[PDB]
Design a binder for this molecule. Structure first.
Ligand SMILES: COc1ccc(CNC(=O)c2ccccc2C[NH2+]Cc2ccc3c(c2C(=O)O)OCO3)cc1
Ligand SMILES: COc1ccc(CNC(=O)c2ccccc2C[NH2+]Cc2ccc3c(c2C(=O)O)OCO3)cc1
Ligand SMILES: [Cl-]
Ligand SMILES: [Cl-]
Lengths: 149, 149
């Protein structure tokens, strides 16, 4: 569980927001891309795995599961590439609610930047710092530290 | 100390590599940009602070210290923007040795990607995972977790 991440792709302003969620904590990283490609997804995962100990990634769709480039990135970075089948139906709703939350935050900050990518990074910040009382950022560090110890 | 980061800018292939180093652990994040601007530096810091609890950033030079855009990003993200004056002379050598190490790793991976940004992210991965026996990635998580607790 400490090493399990889930990919998620959502759309806004004719662009794609690619999100990685640390399942156990709700911590996220995200980027804006023109379109979801294996190339972009592969690069995103390479970045993620250099920053956090990513053991397993549940891909967001079958195209990214199939993509040889995504498979190669997962090979390179020592990531177990898995499907994203919601054998637990609650997964679906959690991701959906997260996308709605993220879009809400983006709306709340949208006039504070010209570019969508800037607003998205503001949303990442706000999401990860929000106390629910610990924040997702606090939870991921505690979970991983406990695992190391 | 758990919240202290240092910016560092180095050059390769006619491009700029912007690095943030977590001082206490040696953990890094990095990106390739065409040139160092306040705009790019500001965006980089916004990304960093959404991902880690960045309390203080020692800027890499006077232009980024002066930049109103960098100041505004630091304001937005709750970062104390400071100078990078090496009152401790050892800081200089550590950063310089890090740049040499990073460039060495980039050379070792360079033929595994077309684009420099990809090689840089591979270097980030290798640097953060390298056991010296804990890795920088393990050290940053332990330092921050201890601070939370
Ligand atoms: C991240 O640093 C920040 C600096 C300042 C502010 C406060 N907001 C404004 O001053 C503002 C508000 C509305 C439109 C334009 C602006 C000025 N431009 C902000 C900006 C900076 C760096 C970037 C950007 C943008 C962008 O506008 O998208 O895009 C990629 O790198 C927020 C964040
Ligand atoms: C990150 O996923 C990886 C997938 C595969 C490999 C193994 N290496 C090769 O197959 C290779 C080797 C040499 C030249 C071109 C290639 C193929 N292209 C790799 C690539 C992928 C995604 C990107 C890229 C690049 C790039 O070439 O820079 O740039 C931004 O997004 C490494 C990383
Ligand atoms: Cl798409
Ligand atoms: Cl420059």
């Amino acid at each position: 569980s400490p090493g399990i991440w889930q990919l998620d792709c959502t759309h806004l302003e004719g662009k794609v927001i690619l999100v990685a969620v640390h399942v156990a904590s709700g911590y996220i990283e995200a980027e804006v891309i023109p379109a979801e490609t294996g190339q972009e997804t592969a690069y995103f995962l390479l970045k993620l795995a250099g920053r956090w100990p990513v053991k397993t990634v549940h891909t967001d769709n079958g195209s990214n599961f199939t993509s040889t480039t995504v498979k190669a990135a997962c090979w390179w970075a020592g990531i177990k590439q898995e499907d994203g089948i919601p054998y637990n139906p609650q997964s679906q709703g959690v991701i959906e609610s997260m996308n709605k939350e993220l879009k809400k935050i983006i709306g709340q900050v949208r006039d504070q930047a010209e570019h969508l990518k800037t607003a998205v990074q503001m949303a990442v910040f706000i999401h990860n710092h929000k106390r629910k009382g610990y924040s997702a950022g606090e939870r991921i560090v505690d979970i991983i530290a406990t695992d190391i110890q």
